[PDB]
Design a protein around this ligand. Structure first.
Ligand code: CLA
Ligand code: CLA
Ligand code: CLA
Ligand code: CLA
Ligand code: CLA
Ligand code: CLA
Ligand code: CLA
Ligand code: CLA
Ligand SMILES: CCCCCCCCCCCCCCCC(=O)OC[C@H](COP(=O)(O)OC[C@@H](O)CO)OC(=O)CCCCCCCCCCCCCCC
Ligand SMILES: CCCCCCCCCCCCO[C@H]1O[C@H](CO)[C@@H](O[C@H]2O[C@H](CO)[C@@H](O)[C@H](O)[C@H]2O)[C@H](O)[C@H]1O
Ligand SMILES: CC1=C(C/C=C(\C)CCC[C@H](C)CCC[C@H](C)CCCC(C)C)C(=O)c2ccccc2C1=O
Lengths: 73, 144, 41, 72, 80, 741, 164, 73
């Protein structure tokens, strides 16, 4: 039980970060803005700083208030 | 008036007791680059391969294994001492090639007669996307 | 001493005065209010 | 080592090894075909991340199997 | 053989040529600037790609531009 | 008079006008910020006095008054410890029972529950049990009262304001000229004679007239309020003649050369004082007398204003040989017009002195009741190895700065310094080999012992019951230096320490010092020490000799000392600068000194320290060093896991602060890996994504957010690596050794 | 008793742990004279300790299987069962002070951009200006939601982008 | 104890996506380097210029996440 859970979590961990890796290779090698005028994929690149700054708020809020509670404890 | 000076290896070396940072076996197989300058007075410069050599009056012949090792020598021979050197490229079949003032004038100043290779008559922000240059035989930058 | 008050109004000096203010305020409150885990009345 | 030390400390260190190989007597019989250069910048990321990750996995899997089966 | 391609945003202040430690760059006449000059890279066979050129270009979104291509014995900077 | 006082009256107006303008020292900083790299370059370039100006006189005046600032801060720091030694301590109670009452001089305030850090240290007192060993200085100084600690604390505040005056005076009001500083003959004659010579003459006079009669009455057993005050030990010669009966002869046996009549209180006893565990104080008194006569003699060596004495330009230029060309010609001129060339040689030996100090104080504990305090012994070793280790890396850093900035290829032609550069490939590569030779043949012995013990083959290990690699040479020296009072030092009553052999000293039912037997585990770990030091030498010396040029980058000195790189070209040129080699050397200094202090803290607890019962003395860890230090798993089990059980379950006690910093520095260490692994061009783009959300809500700052520089993010990284690394071992050592020792 | 819990005034492992701590303090207290300040300090520690247990049971904090005060961070289970002081009162006691520091720091940056060189007044904080915005920012939610209604809080797409 | 660790998992999930979605979105360029698409996915840097561009590529933005992935799992 210990091996079969931990195996398919790191196997899940490596596969999930490769989805974003080959998602990042998509925007360089395969993305065409003239083909993708105004779709949902280009609106991702349009408000792309709103995505990253709101992730950077959630990650910063959680790290402040999870570590801060453990250090308090 | 200027064209393509040749070399004699008769010209004396700077007085330098030899360093371990000098040539290697690449000089005997691939290429090694020799450098000449005309010194007015006897003074002490730094070897780019570590140490210090003294130059003597008249021509001075020195040899290296890289191109940066010669141009990082002329950089301290032109800026510090206001000499006018030029370095060549020697192949082990005896062939020699003239390199640095390749049209006489140093490359910071216009010669009006050198040809403008490797230029784009367009702006760097106006490159194409890599989807257009995909399957170009080899992997290829969109700036081509 | 106008130039000396500019130094007192720089960034690290106001930082080390205001942090002695804000810690020193919370230290005195946590003296006269021992261990506030939950907001009482 | 591939993550804190980066490439250019190592390329200078190899240039001394090339010297000490090309000037050593009786080892000048031996010479390489591919020239020894240091591992590139992107490679040092990958080689260091692989040593990070393999050693991460083998550490915890050793602790996971032996702490469970040690008392069970 | 690295790929050095420069662009029309050049102003011809020739700081890239003076910064190039390998004589990759030189100054060619060109009417699109006050200094009447634009760089050129006839010696990209000798380039290492150390990018001292585009540390020195003043123009926003650098005019000189170095693309790291396939490395020969001169591009890897080898005395051996 | 070529050697003469030469100052300049009022060079700088004493004014607050330049405190209004930060970055005033440099051209690049005085125009204000536009970027958060301004305020980091402000603190980075602040004390880079060679980079502010070009004038060597203006540099020299800046480093002369900054040294009064460092001394003035040390006088505050000393006066704190005497004051916290006076008003918040148990030094009154500690002297009466210095076997049971734990030394404590820090008391915390009862606010958030942090008063639990006031442990039950004994002596009717609660406070943090200190480990810096001031109470053992003060019994060696014969303090005996908290009045004496308070008066020398006020004497420390007075001296600190005098030092702050002196740096103010010798910079702003009357600052010296350049040729004052360039009298290195006059500086060494004054520092060897006046500082070191008259200092150890004066301290011996403190040890003759104060500490010897006080500590003779403490060893004979007198309550400290009943001992005569030390000024009564001056005014009354008849009191001193009661303890040592040769003060009745006065100072007549000195001038009549009847120095053998002083044998009562200038002795050559050796070993240890068995009442108190420390060295004999009359031994240390004859020490500092003979040290003083040596340095006052050596302080009349160099020529200043009369023709007698040596001249260091002639001394250097005459020592030349057939192998080295010009010899030492030109080293006087670079050790006189360059501070970094001075700072490199100074930090080398002053760092090497600190490791001499650390090794010579566990073995010959100079202070009364120092050796039985296992907490003080562990900290005074460990501290003085690290303070040595940083200063040795500082020698490698500021020697490289000499090669970049103040090196002159003109005046250095075929001297030693020019010829070292010309065979720098032979230097590094033969050092490269011996590091790889020491790499396999020291650490691979541990991998061999790990594999053989895991493969069920304990007879094939490298241990004492197996393939025996004995330290034959060091075991030979212990057989000689213990037999040294036989015929090579016939006037010694005992050996120079007790590590060489003999019997142990039992003070308070605990071992002060017992002999140390070296085995195959001691063989392997000393070659681990030889390995990690040679690699630390390899990195730092590569940064010194390839500071200016290499086959990789020929124009490296034009790029300066601290630059990141020369770009991704020629394969990549990350970390090629001479700053970056003393970046990497800090990890190996961390790696070398951690194994030094681990080999100290486990050899002592296995083979030296521990309680004595006169019934088969037992040690702290039971005597398991040579049995277990063969394997990396022995260092894992028996040292890092077995001894960590006093830092991890120390909560609810006074040692619970050490449990926090144990987690605290495990955090800060790992926090550094964010900086040591990642790079700037990531973090700059992430700032752009959050400047965007600050642009959107109109809170865009004027000092524009940039990511930390390439060399800065490395410098932040190694600073948090060392702070998180060392404070882990700090809290591990002290929570171990305060409880079990 | 909300989520498998119990009042700390009603659980017994809470009172067992209170008697555990006071046992550790008293066996530490025994080494000192009854006049001595190392014993005056420990008896003052106890009266801070025993009042702390009295005050946690007074507020009706929830204990559980381990006898420790457990918090309920949900409105509707804290408003209904009388526990808004655990989380729901300090979640607005914080967010007053938090946006206060944000608004004062906002108003200091907005009122410094219309100057000669505003980067100088981020080093040298204009103390008569900064304290003036510090006091008068005490009604910052009353000022922000009025700025929220205009369109002057959010700057438009003058903001800087890369390649949309 | 399970309150605190699921938020720590939530920290590790939101931060690993922060690194990766930034590696996807800023794969084509940032204000630091507006032609990142011209070099490709896996390039070392863009030199020491413009303040220094260590780890600027989307490959180097992917690899930082593997540390924060192995942390999270
Ligand atoms: C369905 C699975 C799948 C497929 C088909 C691909 C396919 C591809 N990927 Mg991708 N990738 C995947 C999953 C996948 N990936 C996952 C799960 C991740 C996250 C870990 C990635 C992360 C990733 C990156 C970051 C990149 C690619 C790239 C590539 C392309 C080049 C292939 C390559 O470099 O191989 C060659 C692979 C190797 C030589 C292996 C390297 C060594 C690895 C780490 C194994 C080491 C294990 C070690 C030796 C264990 C032994 C220990 C010992 C003690 C026992 C190719 C299109 C590259 C690309 O397209 O460039 C633009 C690229 O940059 N991938
Ligand atoms: C233990 C190590 C460690 C820690 C603490 C972090 C922490 C963080 N990383 Mg990570 N990181 C690490 C290792 C670590 N990383 C490693 C090894 C890598 C691979 C290189 C990365 C790669 C990486 C990337 C690529 C990214 C992060 C991000 C983040 C941030 C996530 C937001 C957050 O939780 O904020 C909470 C932060 C904290 C709680 C730390 C602050 C500590 C206290 C609260 C500060 C005040 C204490 C005290 C007063 C200061 C004393 C100093 C002085 C006064 C003496 C945070 C700063 C992301 C980011 O920026 O998100 C915003 C991001 O994009 N990291
Ligand atoms: C006699 C001692 C001595 C002296 C006078 C100097 C003097 C100098 N060093 Mg030097 N150095 C020393 C020892 C010394 N060093 C040692 C022991 C090392 C090895 C670690 C170095 C390594 C070193 C490097 C690598 C560099 C210098 C540089 C410099 C110059 C400028 C320093 C500056 O402005 O920083 C101002 C001071 C600071 C920025 C403070 C740094 C903050 C530290 C790292 C944090 C640690 C503080 C504390 C221990 C942690 C706890 C604090 C708490 C709040 C958490 C100056 C000539 C620099 C130079 O010349 O540039 C060309 C440079 O790059 N030195
Ligand atoms: C050992 C501690 C120490 C000492 C003696 C000095 C000494 C000095 N610093 Mg300094 N500094 C230190 C630590 C120290 N620093 C640290 C840790 C930092 C942060 C990295 C700085 C950052 C710093 C900056 C940014 C500047 C100085 C400056 C100065 C000089 C001005 C003297 C002055 O105004 O004193 C009088 C001050 C008193 C408090 C009087 C004592 C009563 C002097 C050489 C200035 C300088 O050299 O400009 C030319 C300057 O601009 N320092
Ligand atoms: C015999 C005379 C004498 C004595 C005792 C000293 C002592 C000292 N010098 Mg020194 N020096 C002397 C002559 C002397 N010097 C001469 C003749 C020159 C010119 C060639 C110099 C040039 C010089 C420089 C350039 C520097 C020193 C430094 C130092 C200090 C070393 C720091 C240390 O190890 O802490 C030892 C600390 C103590 C022993 C504490 C006691 C301090 C006493 C009270 C002050 C020193 C006595 C003073 C020289 C006598 C004049 C008194 C004054 C009122 C006029 C130390 C205070 C360094 C220093 O720290 O700068 C401040 C330094 O950078 N000296
Ligand atoms: C700088 C150190 C120092 C100082 C200040 C003194 C000062 C003093 N010593 Mg002293 N002494 C010293 C070093 C010192 N000594 C050393 C190194 C020795 C060993 C050789 C002695 C051995 C000595 C003896 C044997 C006696 C003194 C005595 C004295 C006192 C009177 C001196 C006299 O009669 O003329 C005087 C207080 C006499 C008295 O002292 C109480 C006395 O009987 N001294
Ligand atoms: C535990 C991690 C680790 C290890 C093993 C190494 C290993 C090494 N480092 Mg290193 N380094 C590390 C972390 C580590 N580093 C870190 C974290 C940093 C960051 C600052 C550095 C920075 C650094 C620098 C800056 C330098 C080194 C150097 C060295 C080398 C000297 C030691 C040597 O030759 O011994 C030999 C190797 C070992 C003892 C490793 C164990 C191998 C065993 C004994 C036997 C080999 C196995 C056998 C062949 C079976 C193979 C099986 C087959 C299937 C292939 C060596 C390659 C120095 C160097 O290269 O010059 C000498 C050097 O200059 N490193
Ligand atoms: C993730 C969000 C979340 C979740 C899962 C719950 C879950 C629950 N809420 Mg709740 N609540 C929340 C957010 C949430 N609340 C917020 C933000 C508010 C507004 C302040 C409320 C207001 C609220 C009320 C007013 C009530 C609940 C009730 C309930 C319970 C049905 C259940 C435990 C109800 C309850 O006690 O059970 C019927 C109830 O009366 N909640
Ligand atoms: C240590 C053994 C050093 C050998 C020693 O005797 O040195 C002495 C010898 C120099 O002797 P000279 O008598 O020429 O030197 C006079 C000295 O004052 C320096 O000029 O050193 C050399 O031959 C170069 C040393 C490189 C040797 C490196 C080996 C490691
Ligand atoms: C800084 C100058 C260097 C020299 C160091 C001088 C330090 C100042 C010390 C002064 C303290 C008085 O010192 C001196 O007082 C008495 C007068 O001789 C001596 O006392 C002695 O002389 C008295 C009369 O002769 C008699 O009571 C006894 O013989 C004896 O007590 C002390 O043996 C000596 O300590
Ligand atoms: C995290 C990280 C950063 C980001 C770090 C940022 C830029 C700095 C960290 C915070 C600084 C210290 C600002 C915080 C304090 C300011 C003075 C503002 C104070 C305001 C109140 C707190 C008083 C890098 O810039 C970097 C660069 C190169 C290699 C690795 C890294 C790296 O790992």
């Amino acid at each position: 039980q210990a091996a079969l859970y931990t195996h398919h979590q790191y196997i899940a961990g490596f596969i999930m970060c490769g989805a974003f890796a080959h998602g990042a290779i998509f925007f360089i090698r395969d993305y065409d803005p003239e083909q993708n005028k105004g779709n949902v994929l280009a609106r991702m690149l349009d408000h792309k700083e709103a995505l990253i700054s709101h992730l950077s708020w959630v990650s910063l809020f959680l790290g402040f208030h999870t570590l801060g509670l453990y250090v308090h404890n | 008036a200027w064209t393509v000076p040749t070399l004699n290896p008769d010209t004396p070396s700077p007085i330098f007791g030899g360093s371990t940072g000098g040539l290697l076996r690449k000089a005997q197989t691939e290429e090694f680059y020799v450098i000449t300058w005309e010194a007015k007075k006897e003074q002490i410069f730094e070897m780019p391969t570590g140490g210090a050599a003294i130059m003597r009056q008249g021509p001075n012949l020195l040899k290296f294994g890289k191109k940066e090792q010669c141009l990082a020598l002329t950089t301290q021979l032109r800026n510090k001492f206001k000499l006018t050197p030029c370095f060549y490229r020697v192949f082990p079949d005896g062939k020699v090639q003239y390199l640095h003032p390749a049209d006489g004038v140093y490359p910071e100043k216009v010669n009006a007669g050198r040809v403008g290779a490797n230029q784009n008559m367009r702006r760097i922000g106006q490159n194409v996307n890599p989807i257009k240059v995909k399957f170009s035989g080899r992997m290829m930058s969109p700036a081509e | 001493m106008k130039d000396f008050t500019t130094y007192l109004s720089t960034a690290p000096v106001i930082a080390t005065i205001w942090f002695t203010f804000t810690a020193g305020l919370l230290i005195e409150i946590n003296r006269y209010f021992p261990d506030p885990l939950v907001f009482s009345f | 080592m591939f993550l804190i030390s980066w490439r250019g400390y190592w390329q200078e260190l190899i240039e001394t090894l090339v010297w000490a190989h090309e000037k050593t007597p009786l080892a000048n019989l031996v010479y390489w075909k591919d020239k020894p250069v240091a591992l590139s910048i992107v490679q040092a990321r990958l080689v260091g991340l692989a040593h990070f990750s393999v050693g991460y996995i083998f550490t915890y899997a050793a602790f996971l199997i032996a702490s469970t089966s040690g008392r069970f | 053989a690295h790929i050095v391609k420069i662009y029309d945003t050049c102003i011809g202040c020739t700081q890239c040529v003076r910064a190039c430690p390998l004589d990759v760059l030189e100054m060619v006449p060109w009417d699109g600037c006050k200094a009447s000059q634009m760089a050129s890279a006839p010696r990209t066979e000798d380039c290492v790609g150390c990018k001292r050129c585009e540390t020195a270009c003043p123009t926003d979104f650098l005019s000189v531009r170095v693309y790291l291509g396939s490395e020969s014995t001169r591009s890897m900077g080898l005395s051996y | 008079k070529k050697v003469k006082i030469a100052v300049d009256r009022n060079p700088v107006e004493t004014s607050f006008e330049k405190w209004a303008k930060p970055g005033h020292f440099s051209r690049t900083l005085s125009k204000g910020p536009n970027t958060t790299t301004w305020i980091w370059n402000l603190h980075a370039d602040a004390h880079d006095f060679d980079s502010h100006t070009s004038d060597l006189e203006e540099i020299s005046r800046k480093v002369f008054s900054a040294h009064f600032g460092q001394l003035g801060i040390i006088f505050i720091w000393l006066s704190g410890m005497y004051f916290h030694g006076a008003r918040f301590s148990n030094y009154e109670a500690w002297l009466s029972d210095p076997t049971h009452i734990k030394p404590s001089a820090q008391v915390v305030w009862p606010i958030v529950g942090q008063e639990i850090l006031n442990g039950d240290v004994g002596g009717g007192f609660q406070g943090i049990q200190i480990t810096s060993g001031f109470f053992q200085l003060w019994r060696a100084s014969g303090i005996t009262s908290e009045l004496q600690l308070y008066t020398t604390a006020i004497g420390g505040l007075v001296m600190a304001a005098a030092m702050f005056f002196a740096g103010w005076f010798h910079y702003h009001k009357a600052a010296p000229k350049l040729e004052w500083f360039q009298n290195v003959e006059s500086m060494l004659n004054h520092h060897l004679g006046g500082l070191l010579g008259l200092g150890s003459l004066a301290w011996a006079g403190h040890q003759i007239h104060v500490s010897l009669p006080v500590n003779k009455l403490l060893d004979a057993g007198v309550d400290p309020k009943e001992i005569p005050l030390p000024h009564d030990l001056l005014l009354n010669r008849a009191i001193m003649a009661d303890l040592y009966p040769s003060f009745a002869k006065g100072i007549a046996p000195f001038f009549t050369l009847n120095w053998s009549e002083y044998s009562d209180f200038l002795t050559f006893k050796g070993g240890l004082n068995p009442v108190t565990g420390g060295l004999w104080l009359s031994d240390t008194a004859h020490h500092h007398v003979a040290i003083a006569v040596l340095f006052l003699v050596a302080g009349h060596m160099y020529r200043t204003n009369w023709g007698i004495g040596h001249s260091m330009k002639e001394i250097l230029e005459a020592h030349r040989g057939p192998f080295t060309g010009e010899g030492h010609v030109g080293l006087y001129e670079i050790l006189t017009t360059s501070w970094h060339a001075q700072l490199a040689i100074n930090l080398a030996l002053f760092g090497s002195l600190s490791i001499i100090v650390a090794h010579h104080m566990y073995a010959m504990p100079p202070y009364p009741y120092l050796a039985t305090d296992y907490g003080t012994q562990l900290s005074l070793f460990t501290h003085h190895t690290w303070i040595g280790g940083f200063c040795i890396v500082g020698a490698g850093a500021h020697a490289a700065i000499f090669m970049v900035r103040d090196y002159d290829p003109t005046n250095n032609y075929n001297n030693l310094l020019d010829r070292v550069i010309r065979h720098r490939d032979a230097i590094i590569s033969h050092l490269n080999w011996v590091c790889i030779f020491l790499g396999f043949h020291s650490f691979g012995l541990y991998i061999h012992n790990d594999t053989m013990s895991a493969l069920g083959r304990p007879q094939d290990m490298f241990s004492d019951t197996a393939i025996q690699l004995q330290p034959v040479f060091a075991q030979w020296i212990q057989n000689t230096h213990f037999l040294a009072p036989q015929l090579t030092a016939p006037n010694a009553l005992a050996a120079t320490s007790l590590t060489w052999g003999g019997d142990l000293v039992a003070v308070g039912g605990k071992v002060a010092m017992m002999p140390i037997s070296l085995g195959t585990s001691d063989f392997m770990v000393h070659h681990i020490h030889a390995f990690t030091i040679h690699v630390t030498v390899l990195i730092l010396l590569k940064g010194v000799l390839f500071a200016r040029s290499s086959r990789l980058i020929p124009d490296k000195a034009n790029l300066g000392f601290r630059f990141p790189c020369d770009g991704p070209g020629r394969g990549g040129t990350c970390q090629v600068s001479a700053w970056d080699h003393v970046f990497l050397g800090l990890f190996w200094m961390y790696n070398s000194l951690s194994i030094v202090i681990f080999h100290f803290s486990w050899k002592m607890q296995s083979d030296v320290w521990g309680t004595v019962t006169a019934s088969g003395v037992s040690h702290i860890t039971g005597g398991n060093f040579a049995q277990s230090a063969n394997t990396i798993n022995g260092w894992l089990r028996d040292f890092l896991w077995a001894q960590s059980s006093q830092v991890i379950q120390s909560y609810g006690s006074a040692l619970s602060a050490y449990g926090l910093i144990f987690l605290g520095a495990h955090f800060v260490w790992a926090f550094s890996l964010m900086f040591l692994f990642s790079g700037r061009g990531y973090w700059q783009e992430l700032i752009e994504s959050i400047v965007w959300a600050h642009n959107k809500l109109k809170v865009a700052p004027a000092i524009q957010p940039r990511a930390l520089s390439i060399t800065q993010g490395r410098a932040v990284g190694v600073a948090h690596y060392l702070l998180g690394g060392i404070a882990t071992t700090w809290s591990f050592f002290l929570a171990r050794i305060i409880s079990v020792g | 008793d909300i989520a498998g819990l119990t009042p700390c005034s009603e659980s017994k492992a809470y009172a067992k742990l209170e008697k555990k701590e006071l046992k550790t303090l008293e066996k530490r207290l025994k080494q000192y004279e009854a006049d001595s300040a190392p014993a005056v300090a420990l008896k003052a520690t106890m009266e801070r300790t025993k009042a702390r247990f009295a005050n946690y049971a007074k507020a009706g904090l929830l204990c559980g299987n381990d006898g420790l005060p457990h918090l309920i961070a949900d409105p509707g289970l804290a408003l209904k069962y009388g526990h808004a002081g655990e989380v729901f009162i300090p979640t607005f006691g914080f967010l007053y002070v938090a946006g206060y520091i944000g608004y004062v720091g906002r108003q200091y940056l907005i009122a410094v951009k219309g100057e000669a060189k505003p980067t100088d007044k981020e080093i040298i904080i204009d103390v008569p200006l900064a304290t003036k915005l510090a006091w008068q920012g005490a009604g910052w939610p009353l000022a922000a939601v009025q700025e929220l209604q205009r369109g002057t809080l959010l700057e438009k797409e003058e903001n800087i982008t890369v390649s949309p | 104890g399970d309150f605190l660790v699921h938020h720590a998992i939530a920290l590790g999930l939101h931060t690993t996506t922060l690194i990766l979605v930034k590696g996807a979105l800023d794969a084509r360029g940032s204000k630091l380097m507006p032609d990142k698409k011209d070099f490709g996915y896996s390039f070392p840097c863009d030199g020491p210029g413009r303040g220094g561009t260590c780890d600027i590529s989307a490959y180097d933005a992917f690899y930082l996440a593997v540390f924060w992935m192995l942390n999270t799992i």
